[PDB]
């Protein structure tokens, strides 16, 4: 999934593929604006 | 005894950096950002 340029961000909060080792990992799916992808980020209150 | 026990407990102090675990910043940050933050815990642990 990560080795692809069909996508825009891959922003994780690469080190992103070895940091990814935890419990139940989700796939929270939703429709955003481009002004709303900006705040799919920790905090952004 | 209580001079050692100060010294062991200051492993877990952040010293103002992101984590006091080097497994955290090395396996999460970018390598120029890891090497600045791991530079910060070195001097902090040295002053202990």
Curated annotation (Swiss-Prot), chain A:
<comment type="function">
    <text>Attaches the virion to the cell membrane by interacting with host receptor, initiating the infection. Binding to human ACE2 and CLEC4M/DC-SIGNR receptors and internalization of the virus into the endosomes of the host cell induces conformational changes in the S glycoprotein. Proteolysis by cathepsin CTSL may unmask the fusion peptide of S2 and activate membrane fusion within endosomes.</text>
</comment>
<protein>
    <recommendedName>
        <fullName>Spike protein S1</fullName>
    </recommendedName>
</protein>
<feature type="glycosylation site" description="N-linked (GlcNAc...) asparagine; by host">
    <location>
        <position position="3"/>
    </location>
</feature>
UniProtKB/Swiss-Prot annotation, chain B:
<comment type="function">
    <text>Acts as a viral fusion peptide which is unmasked following S2 cleavage occurring upon virus endocytosis.</text>
</comment>
<protein>
    <recommendedName>
        <fullName>Spike protein S2'</fullName>
    </recommendedName>
</protein>
<feature type="coiled-coil region">
    <location>
        <begin position="1"/>
        <end position="38"/>
    </location>
</feature>
